[PDB]
Amino acid sequence: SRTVITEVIATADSQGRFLNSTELQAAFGRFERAVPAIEAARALTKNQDALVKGAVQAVFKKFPYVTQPGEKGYGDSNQAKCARDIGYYLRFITYSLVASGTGPLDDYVIAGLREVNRAFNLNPLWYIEALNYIKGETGKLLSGQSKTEALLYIDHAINALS
Amino acid sequence: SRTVITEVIATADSQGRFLNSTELQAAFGRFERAVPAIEAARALTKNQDALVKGAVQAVFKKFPYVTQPGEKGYGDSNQAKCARDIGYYLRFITYSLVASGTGPLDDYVIAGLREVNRAFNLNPLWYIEALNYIKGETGKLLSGQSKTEALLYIDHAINALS
Amino acid sequence: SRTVITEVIATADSQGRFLNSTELQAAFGRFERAVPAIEAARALTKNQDALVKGAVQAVFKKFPYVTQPGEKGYGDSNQAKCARDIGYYLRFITYSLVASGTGPLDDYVIAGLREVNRAFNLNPLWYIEALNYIKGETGKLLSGQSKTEALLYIDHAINALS
Amino acid sequence: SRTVITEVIATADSQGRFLNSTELQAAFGRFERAVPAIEAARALTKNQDALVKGAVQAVFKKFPYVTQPGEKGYGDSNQAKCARDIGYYLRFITYSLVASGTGPLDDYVIAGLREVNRAFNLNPLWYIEALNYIKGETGKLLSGQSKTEALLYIDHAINALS
Amino acid sequence: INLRAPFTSEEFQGALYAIYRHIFGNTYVMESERPTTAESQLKDGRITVRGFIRLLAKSEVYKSRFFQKTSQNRFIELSHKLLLGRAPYDQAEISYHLDLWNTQGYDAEIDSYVDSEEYLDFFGEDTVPYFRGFKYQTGQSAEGF
Amino acid sequence: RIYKITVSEAGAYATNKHRTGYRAPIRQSNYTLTVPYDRFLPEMIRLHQSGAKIVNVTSV
Amino acid sequence: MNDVFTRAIAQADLKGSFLLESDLDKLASFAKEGVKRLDAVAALTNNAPAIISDAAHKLFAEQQELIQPGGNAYPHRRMAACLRDMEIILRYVSYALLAGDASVLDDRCLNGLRETYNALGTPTQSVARAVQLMKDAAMVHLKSTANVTVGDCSSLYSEAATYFDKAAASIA
Amino acid sequence: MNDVFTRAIAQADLKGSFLLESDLDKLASFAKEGVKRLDAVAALTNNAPAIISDAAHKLFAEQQELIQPGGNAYPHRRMAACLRDMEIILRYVSYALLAGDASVLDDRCLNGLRETYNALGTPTQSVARAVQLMKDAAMVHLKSTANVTVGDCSSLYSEAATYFDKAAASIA
Amino acid sequence: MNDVFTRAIAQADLKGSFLLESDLDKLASFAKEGVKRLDAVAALTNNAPAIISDAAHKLFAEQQELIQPGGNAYPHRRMAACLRDMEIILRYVSYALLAGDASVLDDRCLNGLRETYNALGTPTQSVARAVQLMKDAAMVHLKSTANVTVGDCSSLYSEAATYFDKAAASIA
Ligand SMILES: CCC1=C(C)/C(=C/C2=NC(=C\c3[nH]c(/C=C4\NC(=O)[C@H](C)[C@H]4CC)c(C)c3CCC(=O)O)/C(CCC(=O)O)=C2C)NC1=O
Ligand SMILES: CCC1=C(C)/C(=C/C2=NC(=C\c3[nH]c(/C=C4\NC(=O)[C@H](C)[C@H]4CC)c(C)c3CCC(=O)O)/C(CCC(=O)O)=C2C)NC1=O
Ligand SMILES: CCC1=C(C)/C(=C/C2=NC(=C\c3[nH]c(/C=C4\NC(=O)[C@H](C)[C@H]4CC)c(C)c3CCC(=O)O)/C(CCC(=O)O)=C2C)NC1=O
Ligand SMILES: CCC1=C(C)/C(=C/C2=NC(=C\c3[nH]c(/C=C4\NC(=O)[C@H](C)[C@H]4CC)c(C)c3CCC(=O)O)/C(CCC(=O)O)=C2C)NC1=O
Ligand SMILES: CCC1=C(C)/C(=C/C2=NC(=C\c3[nH]c(/C=C4\NC(=O)[C@H](C)[C@H]4CC)c(C)c3CCC(=O)O)/C(CCC(=O)O)=C2C)NC1=O
Ligand SMILES: CCC1=C(C)/C(=C/C2=NC(=C\c3[nH]c(/C=C4\NC(=O)[C@H](C)[C@H]4CC)c(C)c3CCC(=O)O)/C(CCC(=O)O)=C2C)NC1=O
Ligand SMILES: CCC1=C(C)/C(=C/C2=NC(=C\c3[nH]c(/C=C4\NC(=O)[C@H](C)[C@H]4CC)c(C)c3CCC(=O)O)/C(CCC(=O)O)=C2C)NC1=O
Ligand SMILES: CCC1=C(C)/C(=C/C2=NC(=C\c3[nH]c(/C=C4\NC(=O)[C@H](C)[C@H]4CC)c(C)c3CCC(=O)O)/C(CCC(=O)O)=C2C)NC1=O
Ligand SMILES: CCC1=C(C)/C(=C/C2=NC(=C\c3[nH]c(/C=C4\NC(=O)[C@H](C)[C@H]4CC)c(C)c3CCC(=O)O)/C(CCC(=O)O)=C2C)NC1=O
Ligand SMILES: CCC1=C(C)/C(=C/C2=NC(=C\c3[nH]c(/C=C4\NC(=O)[C@H](C)[C@H]4CC)c(C)c3CCC(=O)O)/C(CCC(=O)O)=C2C)NC1=O
Ligand SMILES: CCC1=C(C)/C(=C/C2=NC(=C\c3[nH]c(/C=C4\NC(=O)[C@H](C)[C@H]4CC)c(C)c3CCC(=O)O)/C(CCC(=O)O)=C2C)NC1=O
Ligand SMILES: CCC1=C(C)/C(=C/C2=NC(=C\c3[nH]c(/C=C4\NC(=O)[C@H](C)[C@H]4CC)c(C)c3CCC(=O)O)/C(CCC(=O)O)=C2C)NC1=O
Ligand SMILES: CCC1=C(C)/C(=C/C2=NC(=C\c3[nH]c(/C=C4\NC(=O)[C@H](C)[C@H]4CC)c(C)c3CCC(=O)O)/C(CCC(=O)O)=C2C)NC1=O
């Protein structure tokens, strides 16, 4: 996936050359930022269930018209799939935090996102609201830099959805 | 010039996207590693004259044959050219330290190096010896990560000559 | 390889057409040039050992330092490799004389010459000196068109080295 | 125009290299076979009118139905254009003989021949018969390498027509 | 890789590396075989990536490695792979290109690849060719993959 | 000989790209290409088919 | 393609001399405050669609003639092209902000844009207005003191404003 | 590609040795005979359409099934391809005659031609037959004494025949 | 691309006449001293690194400002470009010398060279001086009588001087 180290190696390889000062300094930055990013992922993993339940509830509060009979938000299967989707997004956000790159998101979620959402008539706004929630509670869950990395990745997901 | 920032921005623009975490961590590493690099550039700029004279003398010690008449090293003009070339290499090493990239070295020395040396029958081994002397001296007058920066750039130049 | 007949046939082949008067005239000229060329090749073959020994000695005369210990000419194996390389060059010059094209040289010596010299730290001026000696000597062993043919091939090899 | 010299230079230019023994030997063959070719060209130029008139009469002998009214040959103007066409073909054969390559023929006759002859409904068999007459008279007007060169060029024109 | 008209030295050298790795089928090209005049013309702006690729395909390196020791079948499939990034879709391509080379020579055959609408749609004068056929292409024949 | 064709795109190329979608990276409109005489006609037809606008052609 | 360090090195090489201690101090300062630079670039990137949407709403509220039939942004694809151009300008402005040098914006995005618009028939003045509107929305988003520790970044605000104004000037 | 000289050089290189005096003598004899070789090649080139037409007429009189509907030279297209292939093979035979080596014929013309014809449904026996008829017509033209100086050229005849029958053997 | 023979053919064609007897004598003369010209072409070809190195040494002694920082041969990259350009110009001069005509030198080498140099900041006077220095070195090498039969060759030296001067005129 597209991370700092993998981009470094891909650029070095595409030009057929070794790793020089620039590439090693980039990798050094990755290895320093690993600490805030990894423990932000730890904090996000710990509070995953509450975050997912709250994101689903926020979707329903903003979109009450999905849950009454006849459309996407109705039924135990649909709501379970909603929980599954928000958990997917959170999982890949934590993956991206650990890997220090949007490679997990870009490769697993964002690639093909619009075609899939169009085919199944899933509104991207639902997931935008869920991720905005996730952002709200990661603001209070996380402090200092960890908050910063988690916000960068959550917002990359949001931007891709919008 | 290839720096961490320029490579960041280039790999972002090639695929037509905004700069994201994968790019900002790389830039962060550059900004953090600037301090030892600027220290090394300061030290190498202070001591340029001693380094250049010592490098020229090291070249003549390793190649006594070149000073003999009818050879490249004979004459006052040729040795003036030698001192000037060592000054060029040291200057570009300091530039590359300041920019935190091999971009200055690559642009001003490494590009067209082989063709120029073959055209004028300049043996790259002379400059390997001069740069090896400069490396030995840089082991002094510098300590810690600044020495690591300086030797990484110097030995980049050495590998390009070899 | 890459010789007059082969260029003729390749040009006809790529243009999807037969061999016409222009190409047959090129081939004609090759067939008459074969006489001084084969004579030069035979003369050089008969005197290969004298030429090779003299070339090695001229190399050592022009570069006295190389025989000194710690250098590329020190030792018996290094000088065995001297003579082997000069024999290689002589062999491929005779090949090119017989083939009436530079294709033997280009395919066996020149293609990969610079990289191999740079890797093993061999100096192209050594081989230029040896080929200059061979040129001077074939000035004596040969005369007329035989000598100009030999000199064209030896000079192609020299220009390849430089 | 494709001549021996021009093919030489174009090949070397495409490879971005100097003219070496191959190119020079092809040029030498051209310069050697120039003299019988120029002899043939002078011979064919001298007997222009007889050759052209005989070729026209031969066309009319092999194609009696052409001259009768209601056909392409009937009339003074079409007669004049017949004579003109055979004269053009002879002229460009002499050009290609002098220039030691079929380039004049390819540039001035062969290129666009089929579509021009289709648009004006000119039978290639008429010109093939005229050229066969030209060959028949060349057999006695010339002897040796001059006759060989002239036959090569005339029958190149024929093969282009057929 | 995309190479615009004002380009840096590192971008230029990387583009050359990519172009040689693709157009020459991952074959080692020696320093004596590299086209310095064509590189100069590309560096100036006299030609584009496309015209540079056309030059390289007409060059003796390409001819010797892919045309002069092969059958026309191998040359056609290999030219499709290297210049279009895809495989031939049917036998009509083989027949078409063989007739093209036979009647108009090698240069016209290269020009068909490089002046093709496929090439211009996907690479278009500034991007290096790449392998497309590892993804579904419209009009593909399911055996092209 | 060689001819320099200066090309522009004032909307026909734009609408063709809008229908097909951006498919190689976007580039500026006005640009010039040098073409030999042998390739002169096909390049001209290709530009006309693409919706390109040629503002002038120069011979050199 | 340069940054502040590469530009300084370029001038140093034209004079033919080593970098001066004043220059070293200046660039060390640039690298010390590059943390704020990363915060500003992240703020520009994370809010890019919001900036573009806000600027589009403002521009189409003010310049109503574009929307109407016969306007430059009427055919629905031309609206798509308008949005794409706005995003490209924002992307290159953020590139230049991170570099600290405006050359990456110019040489790659702005050198031919004027002639492109003129050949097309696009009103360049409305494009400049869109760039200024993007500048306003971007200033609002960078100055957001939340999400980051409070600090003095007037230099970043000035630099971003210069990049937006220079893009607008080159367009119109 | 290889001519006779380049093969000789290749074996000499494989041994790592110079070219012996006998090998140089053989190459000298080749280059002396080169003018006769040129006459043979020009006879093949100059009279090529006649050779192809004669071979086609004989072949399609012998094998009428080829030109009936359902034959493999029935529609105009397949007949054009048939004549094209015959011209191509004769042209590579002329190349091999000039080079003194059958290497170009193998590498270019007969590299995979049998599998090509097997996949097309083309009768390889009939293709070989066409190559034999072309060989006969070629020998008729190459033995012609008009417009050449009389001499012994039997080695060239046998070598041309070997190129022809090597093509026919590779096909069938 | 044109030589003396095709030049005469074109001049005859524009009038639509057979090449005159006088033209045949001049062309046969050109063909007789073709061997004389091959030696000059080989002298240019063999000694090209020597000619270029000599001219470069003299040029960079005469004009130091090219090699200091800010000059146009200053970095290795521009220095290599300059050496390459000298290589190319000598190559095309030798092509013209072999062809007997300067049409190649106009068509391929110098078609838009002065404009390129003007756009790149290259002092065309420096390039013209470089061509003149190569002309001096080339004349030194062509006149060498070693390894060649003695004969009058003032025509070849004059013609090569015209080629070098014409190249310098087109660049400057
Ligand atoms: C920007 C980077 C740059 C470099 C590195 C550079 C090296 C360089 N050194 C040169 C001169 C030279 N430099 C030397 C160096 C020798 N002196 C002896 O004392 C030693 C054995 C040895 C040095 C260790 C010599 C012998 C020459 C003269 C070469 C000649 O013209 O024959 C020249 C040719 C000057 C000319 O055109 O007249 C170059 C290009 N030039 C550049 O623009
Ligand atoms: C087909 C043509 C061909 C050539 C030309 C060729 C040259 C060649 N010579 C070599 C050895 C060598 N050649 C030399 C050079 C000689 N010794 C010095 O004293 C003299 C100044 C000089 C005589 C001119 C040396 C010193 C070595 C040993 C290098 C080493 O192993 O480090 C090597 C290294 C590989 C080995 O160990 O054999 C190569 C590649 N190889 C080839 O396959
Ligand atoms: C330089 C190369 C060149 C060639 C070869 C050439 C041939 C040529 N001959 C023409 C006329 C013609 N030429 C002929 C020749 C016929 N007259 C009969 O006595 C014969 C059976 C037969 C000739 C053997 C005829 C019938 C026409 C009139 C055709 C027409 O107007 O449709 C034309 C049409 C131009 C016109 O009518 O204004 C061409 C192009 N032109 C060229 O520029
Ligand atoms: C994934 C990156 C990558 C690799 C690893 C790679 C290896 C590689 N080496 C090759 C040739 C070669 N490789 C070798 C090396 C061998 N010769 C022996 O003597 C040695 C014991 C041994 C080396 C240790 C040789 C000699 C050839 C050329 C064979 C020939 O020319 O006939 C080739 C064929 C391309 C060509 O011939 O031009 C490839 C693909 N290429 C790549 O793109
Ligand atoms: C450059 C070397 C080379 C050659 C020569 C070559 C031959 C070749 N011949 C082909 C077809 C053909 N070839 C023939 C020839 C046959 N017709 C009758 O059967 C005869 C017995 C016989 C000729 C005497 C025919 C009829 C076709 C058309 C087959 C079809 O459409 O099914 C094809 C398939 C593409 C096409 O239709 O043109 C190839 C590739 N391939 C190569 O790479
Ligand atoms: C013109 C006719 C044609 C077809 C139909 C075609 C299909 C096709 N499907 C592909 C991949 C794929 N196809 C599928 C679809 C399958 N897997 C799912 O589970 C389903 C069970 C099932 C669909 C109902 C999937 C999942 C992939 C991705 C495989 C991978 O790359 O890992 C690919 C590889 C390139 C790509 O990923 O786009 C092709 C070429 N190609 C053709 O030329
Ligand atoms: C280097 C980066 C780059 C940029 C920025 C760029 C601008 C650009 N804008 C274009 C069209 C356009 N651009 C616009 C946008 C403007 N008109 C509206 O009034 C808005 C107010 C305003 C947007 C802020 C519109 C509406 C078009 C469509 C013109 C038309 O189709 O008539 C086109 C032509 C599209 C094509 O040929 O397919 C280009 C090339 N080109 C580039 O290569
Ligand atoms: C893409 C749109 C298009 C254009 C712009 C076009 C005109 C056009 N005419 C051309 C040549 C030509 N055009 C003519 C036209 C003839 N001269 C007069 O005698 C006749 C009255 C006149 C008949 C109309 C001629 C003689 C040439 C050849 C010019 C030469 O090579 O000297 C060429 C160059 C051919 C090439 O280099 O391959 C073009 C592009 N045709 C097109 O399809
Ligand atoms: C992964 C990408 C990445 C980012 C985003 C990043 C930003 C970043 N911001 C920081 C604090 C800061 N952040 C800012 C930003 C300013 N504050 C004001 O409110 C302005 C609105 C705003 C300008 C946009 C400032 C002024 C500081 C404190 C500087 C200092 O520590 O002295 C710090 C240092 C915190 C510490 O270790 O104590 C970092 C590393 N670093 C990264 O590696
Ligand atoms: C797909 C449809 C198709 C067509 C149209 C076709 C035409 C055709 N007719 C042929 C025979 C022929 N056909 C004719 C035509 C007639 N003879 C005279 O009585 C008339 C003047 C003249 C017609 C008006 C002639 C003269 C030949 C002789 C070819 C030969 O001798 O080999 C041949 C050569 C094969 C053979 O020897 O039989 C072809 C290819 N072939 C096809 O497969
Ligand atoms: C432009 C293309 C070109 C051609 C065509 C060419 C042919 C050529 N044939 C020659 C003689 C000859 N040609 C032949 C060959 C013929 N004798 C028999 O009738 C055979 C049927 C037939 C062989 C296929 C022979 C035997 C000689 C006598 C010279 C000798 O035997 O060495 C000569 C020497 C001078 C002479 O006696 O006329 C030449 C140059 N040279 C060229 O540059
Ligand atoms: C068709 C044959 C052909 C020619 C003739 C040709 C000339 C040529 N020279 C160029 C640059 C150059 N040419 C020179 C040489 C001059 N500068 C002065 O300082 C020196 C006195 C003088 C050395 C003799 C230099 C230094 C450059 C690089 C300019 C730059 O990078 O700004 C360039 C553009 C960029 C490049 O290639 O690096 C071209 C196209 N290219 C070709 O493909
Ligand atoms: C393989 C490539 C090749 C070359 C290089 C070549 C040159 C060549 N030079 C020759 C003699 C000659 N060479 C020259 C050249 C002049 N002599 C003066 O010293 C000038 C310095 C010099 C000006 C360049 C002259 C004047 C002759 C005498 C030609 C004659 O006898 O009329 C000859 C004729 C030898 C004879 O019959 O006695 C040839 C064939 N031929 C080839 O096939």
mmCIF file of N, CA and C and ligand atoms in Angstrom, chain A residues 33 145 148-149 152, chain B residues 21 24-25 28, chain G residues 35-36 38-40 42-43 142-145 148-153 156-157, ligand 9:
data_model
loop_
_atom_site.group_PDB
_atom_site.id
_atom_site.type_symbol
_atom_site.label_atom_id
_atom_site.label_comp_id
_atom_site.label_asym_id
_atom_site.label_seq_id
_atom_site.Cartn_x
_atom_site.Cartn_y
_atom_site.Cartn_z
ATOM 1 N N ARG A 33 6.979 9.867 13.595
ATOM 2 C CA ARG A 33 5.542 10.041 13.775
ATOM 3 C C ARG A 33 4.832 8.746 14.106
ATOM 4 N N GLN A 145 -0.721 15.412 19.313
ATOM 5 C CA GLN A 145 -0.500 15.082 17.912
ATOM 6 C C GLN A 145 -1.388 13.934 17.456
ATOM 7 N N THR A 148 -4.136 14.925 15.855
ATOM 8 C CA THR A 148 -3.839 15.477 14.540
ATOM 9 C C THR A 148 -3.794 14.392 13.470
ATOM 10 N N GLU A 149 -3.060 13.301 13.709
ATOM 11 C CA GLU A 149 -3.001 12.266 12.679
ATOM 12 C C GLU A 149 -4.366 11.637 12.443
ATOM 13 N N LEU A 152 -6.332 13.873 10.278
ATOM 14 C CA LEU A 152 -5.907 13.834 8.881
ATOM 15 C C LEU A 152 -6.520 12.650 8.155
ATOM 16 N N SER B 21 -1.098 13.018 4.529
ATOM 17 C CA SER B 21 -0.201 12.643 5.618
ATOM 18 C C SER B 21 1.075 11.992 5.098
ATOM 19 N N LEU B 24 3.258 14.828 4.372
ATOM 20 C CA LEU B 24 3.571 15.743 5.459
ATOM 21 C C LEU B 24 4.506 15.107 6.477
ATOM 22 N N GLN B 25 4.406 13.794 6.687
ATOM 23 C CA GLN B 25 5.387 13.131 7.546
ATOM 24 C C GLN B 25 6.779 13.193 6.934
ATOM 25 N N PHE B 28 8.038 16.603 7.494
ATOM 26 C CA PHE B 28 8.393 16.728 8.900
ATOM 27 C C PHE B 28 9.776 16.166 9.178
ATOM 28 N N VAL G 35 6.980 23.495 10.909
ATOM 29 C CA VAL G 35 5.871 22.827 11.579
ATOM 30 C C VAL G 35 4.564 23.579 11.358
ATOM 31 N N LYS G 36 4.592 24.896 11.538
ATOM 32 C CA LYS G 36 3.431 25.710 11.222
ATOM 33 C C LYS G 36 3.073 25.594 9.749
ATOM 34 N N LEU G 38 3.425 22.938 7.901
ATOM 35 C CA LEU G 38 2.705 21.679 7.747
ATOM 36 C C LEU G 38 1.276 21.806 8.243
ATOM 37 N N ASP G 39 1.074 22.516 9.351
ATOM 38 C CA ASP G 39 -0.289 22.745 9.823
ATOM 39 C C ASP G 39 -1.115 23.511 8.795
ATOM 40 N N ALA G 40 -0.528 24.539 8.183
ATOM 41 C CA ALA G 40 -1.254 25.319 7.188
ATOM 42 C C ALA G 40 -1.587 24.488 5.959
ATOM 43 N N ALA G 42 -1.930 21.202 5.832
ATOM 44 C CA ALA G 42 -2.966 20.256 6.216
ATOM 45 C C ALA G 42 -4.327 20.925 6.285
ATOM 46 N N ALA G 43 -4.387 22.151 6.804
ATOM 47 C CA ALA G 43 -5.651 22.875 6.837
ATOM 48 C C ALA G 43 -6.162 23.160 5.433
ATOM 49 N N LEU G 142 -7.526 28.282 7.414
ATOM 50 C CA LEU G 142 -6.209 28.273 8.047
ATOM 51 C C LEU G 142 -6.232 28.947 9.411
ATOM 52 N N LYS G 143 -6.936 30.073 9.543
ATOM 53 C CA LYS G 143 -6.915 30.776 10.819
ATOM 54 C C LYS G 143 -7.652 30.030 11.923
ATOM 55 N N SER G 144 -8.213 28.857 11.632
ATOM 56 C CA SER G 144 -8.964 28.103 12.627
ATOM 57 C C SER G 144 -8.068 27.653 13.769
ATOM 58 N N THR G 145 -8.132 28.353 14.898
ATOM 59 C CA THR G 145 -7.235 28.087 16.012
ATOM 60 C C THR G 145 -7.516 26.765 16.702
ATOM 61 N N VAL G 148 -5.203 22.709 16.666
ATOM 62 C CA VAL G 148 -3.770 22.976 16.679
ATOM 63 C C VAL G 148 -3.475 23.851 17.884
ATOM 64 N N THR G 149 -2.254 23.758 18.399
ATOM 65 C CA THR G 149 -1.862 24.646 19.485
ATOM 66 C C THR G 149 -1.725 26.072 18.969
ATOM 67 N N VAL G 150 -2.207 27.023 19.761
ATOM 68 C CA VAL G 150 -2.281 28.413 19.333
ATOM 69 C C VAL G 150 -0.873 28.956 19.144
ATOM 70 N N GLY G 151 -0.707 29.817 18.148
ATOM 71 C CA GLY G 151 0.607 30.332 17.817
ATOM 72 C C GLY G 151 0.512 31.451 16.810
ATOM 73 N N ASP G 152 1.646 32.105 16.592
ATOM 74 C CA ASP G 152 1.710 33.218 15.659
ATOM 75 C C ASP G 152 2.110 32.695 14.291
ATOM 76 N N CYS G 153 1.203 32.811 13.326
ATOM 77 C CA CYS G 153 1.451 32.328 11.976
ATOM 78 C C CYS G 153 1.033 33.368 10.957
ATOM 79 N N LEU G 156 2.519 32.738 7.554
ATOM 80 C CA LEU G 156 1.828 31.765 6.715
ATOM 81 C C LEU G 156 0.613 32.381 6.039
ATOM 82 N N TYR G 157 -0.154 33.177 6.781
ATOM 83 C CA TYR G 157 -1.310 33.844 6.200
ATOM 84 C C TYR G 157 -0.886 34.759 5.066
HETATM 85 C C1 LIG J 9 1.613 14.428 9.996
HETATM 86 C C2 LIG J 9 1.600 15.871 9.570
HETATM 87 C C3 LIG J 9 2.167 16.833 10.690
HETATM 88 C C4 LIG J 9 1.561 17.979 11.185
HETATM 89 C C5 LIG J 9 0.223 18.576 10.757
HETATM 90 C C6 LIG J 9 2.393 18.490 12.139
HETATM 91 C C7 LIG J 9 2.059 19.758 12.891
HETATM 92 C C8 LIG J 9 2.659 20.114 14.357
HETATM 93 N N1 LIG J 9 2.143 21.123 15.033
HETATM 94 C C9 LIG J 9 2.743 21.293 16.191
HETATM 95 C C10 LIG J 9 2.386 22.383 17.249
HETATM 96 C C11 LIG J 9 1.984 23.759 16.527
HETATM 97 N N2 LIG J 9 1.146 23.908 15.505
HETATM 98 C C12 LIG J 9 1.052 25.189 15.172
HETATM 99 C C13 LIG J 9 0.119 25.687 13.977
HETATM 100 C C14 LIG J 9 -0.527 27.027 14.214
HETATM 101 N N3 LIG J 9 -1.202 27.097 15.360
HETATM 102 C C15 LIG J 9 -2.020 28.368 15.132
HETATM 103 O O1 LIG J 9 -3.146 28.273 15.665
HETATM 104 C C16 LIG J 9 -2.191 28.467 13.510
HETATM 105 C C17 LIG J 9 -3.748 28.584 13.149
HETATM 106 C C18 LIG J 9 -1.706 27.383 13.075
HETATM 107 C C19 LIG J 9 -1.056 27.567 11.645
HETATM 108 C C20 LIG J 9 -1.743 26.680 10.579
HETATM 109 C C21 LIG J 9 1.893 25.933 16.038
HETATM 110 C C22 LIG J 9 2.176 27.469 16.109
HETATM 111 C C23 LIG J 9 2.481 25.004 16.896
HETATM 112 C C24 LIG J 9 3.470 25.280 18.034
HETATM 113 C C25 LIG J 9 4.912 25.554 17.570
HETATM 114 C C26 LIG J 9 5.906 25.259 18.706
HETATM 115 O O2 LIG J 9 5.925 24.128 19.223
HETATM 116 O O3 LIG J 9 6.696 26.157 19.121
HETATM 117 C C27 LIG J 9 3.743 20.349 16.309
HETATM 118 C C28 LIG J 9 4.716 20.165 17.499
HETATM 119 C C29 LIG J 9 3.994 19.666 18.809
HETATM 120 C C30 LIG J 9 5.032 19.096 19.870
HETATM 121 O O4 LIG J 9 5.727 18.061 19.580
HETATM 122 O O5 LIG J 9 5.172 19.667 21.004
HETATM 123 C C31 LIG J 9 3.701 19.587 15.141
HETATM 124 C C32 LIG J 9 4.675 18.419 14.879
HETATM 125 N N4 LIG J 9 3.438 17.716 12.216
HETATM 126 C C33 LIG J 9 3.344 16.706 11.370
HETATM 127 O O6 LIG J 9 4.319 15.652 11.196
#
